[PDB]
Design a protein around this nucleic acid. Structure first.
Ligand SMILES: Nc1nc2c([nH]c(=O)n2[C@H]2C[C@H](O)[C@@H](COP(=O)(O)OP(=O)(O)OP(=O)(O)O)O2)c(=O)[nH]1
Ligand SMILES: [Ca+2]
Ligand SMILES: [Ca+2]
Ligand SMILES: [Ca+2]
Ligand SMILES: [Cl-]
Ligand SMILES: [Cl-]
Ligand code: NA
Length: 327
DNA sequence: CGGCATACG
DNA sequence: CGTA
DNA sequence: GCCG
């Protein structure tokens, strides 16, 4: 009854197994910090299964027959059910390796590979990094200077004012171009670590060269604290605050209107949902999906889509609104 | 055992 | 390498 | 770590 792919089931934002899913996601994160992407995926998938259940897991028996629950994830749930804590999870939580890899990977411009190298070099704190800044990229210097502001969640109540400033710049760059809020906010989240906007124009081709024009205008308005032809921009924006402002991460993405449903799907997430959707497409339907299109490699054709609904139908999946893609 | 999503900057 |  |  519980299908194996997260794109085959509704996953709401809030659910009935929060504590169990959070513990599995700690182990998933730690697996990623060690480069074990397969174990990260299994732990992420097991957590996601619990998010999709209709009521709390109260006894181990209820894991029987659920996909992605083997001996390891079942033992994690078992210990939480019996003692309220999982020793493995707590050992990870307080480990110096986990805490420092988390601290470092949270910096904009630092990935797992860089954080791991720093860890092996003996670095442990943000002040350790600030001491020899010539070792940092320009992106990493920005991420480090802005780290405190970037560590505070963006509120959905901040987003509308920001969307209006982006829309003004976009409308000057290309009258008729539109801005769509994507990411976790579109899935219903009340906060997020960054804001995501998808930009298009109803006349195919008119969006060509648009993003530099947008960025130049936003920069001239004094709103860009950091930015790098292009179609994705990963920025730090000045967001107004009472008597002041704060730095917020903002992603801007441009797509032609022909690709807009695919880009909207991809950027609306969740990350696990998109990975599972692309895996399902490829492995179950023989179709190749990304944020630009859906390719039939046998007939060498791209599927036209006018809506997200179209894409779910192409793939033979029941339609899920964004609020049920919180895998 | 092989596979694990798939892009752009 | 970083980013989504 | 788990599925097929
Ligand atoms: N972060 C991230 N997002 C990805 C990846 N691959 C992929 O398709 N995405 C898509 C799905 C994400 O939900 C969407 C937006 O990315 P995001 O990091 O802003 O995630 P979010 O809005 O869901 O989360 P948040 O800001 O509330 O923390 O981009 C990836 O590797 N990392
Ligand atoms: Ca099982
Ligand atoms: Ca976001
Ligand atoms: Ca983002
Ligand atoms: Cl592995
Ligand atoms: Cl893509
Ligand atoms: Na990072």
């Amino acid at each position: 009854w519980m299908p194996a792919y997260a794109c085959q089931r509704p996953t709401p934002l809030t659910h009935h197994n929060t504590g169990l899913s959070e513990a599995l996601e700690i182990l998933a994160e730690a697996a990623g910090f060690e480069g074990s992407e397969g174990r990260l995926l299994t732990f992420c998938r097991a957590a996601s299964v619990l998010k999709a259940l209709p009521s709390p897991v109260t006894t181990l028996s209820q894991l029987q027959g659920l996909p992605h629950f083997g001996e390891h994830s079942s033992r994690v749930v078992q210990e939480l059910l019996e003692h309220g804590v999982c020793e493995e999870v707590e050992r990870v939580r307080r480990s110096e390796r986990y805490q420092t890899m988390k601290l470092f990977t949270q910096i904009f411009g630092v990935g797992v590979k860089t954080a791991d190298r720093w860890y092996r070099e003996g670095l442990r704190t943000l002040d350790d990094l600030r001491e020899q800044p010539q070792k940092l990229t320009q992106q990493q210097k920005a991420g480090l200077q802005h780290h405190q502001d970037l560590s505070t969640p963006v509120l959905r109540s901040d987003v509308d004012a920001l969307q209006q400033v982006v829309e003004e710049a976009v409308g000057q760059a290309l009258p008729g171009a539109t801005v769509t809020l994507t990411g976790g906010f579109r899935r219903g989240k009340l906060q997020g670590h960054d804001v995501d906007f998808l930009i298009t124009h109803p006349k195919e081709g008119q969006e060509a060269g648009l993003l530099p024009r947008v960025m130049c205008r936003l920069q001239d308005q004094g709103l860009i604290l950091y930015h790098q032809a292009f179609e994705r921009s990963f920025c730090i924006f000045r967001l107004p605050q009472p008597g002041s402002w704060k730095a917020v991460r903002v992603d801007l993405v441009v797509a032609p209107v022909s690709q807009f449903p695919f880009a909207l799907l991809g950027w609306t997430g969740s990350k696990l949902f998109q990975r599972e959707l692309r895996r399902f497409s490829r492995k179950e339907k023989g179709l190749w999906l990304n944020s630009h299109g859906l390719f039939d490699p046998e007939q060498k054709t791209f599927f036209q889509a006018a809506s997200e609904e179209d894409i779910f139908r192409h793939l033979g999946l029941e339609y899920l609104p964004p609020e049920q893609r919180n895998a």
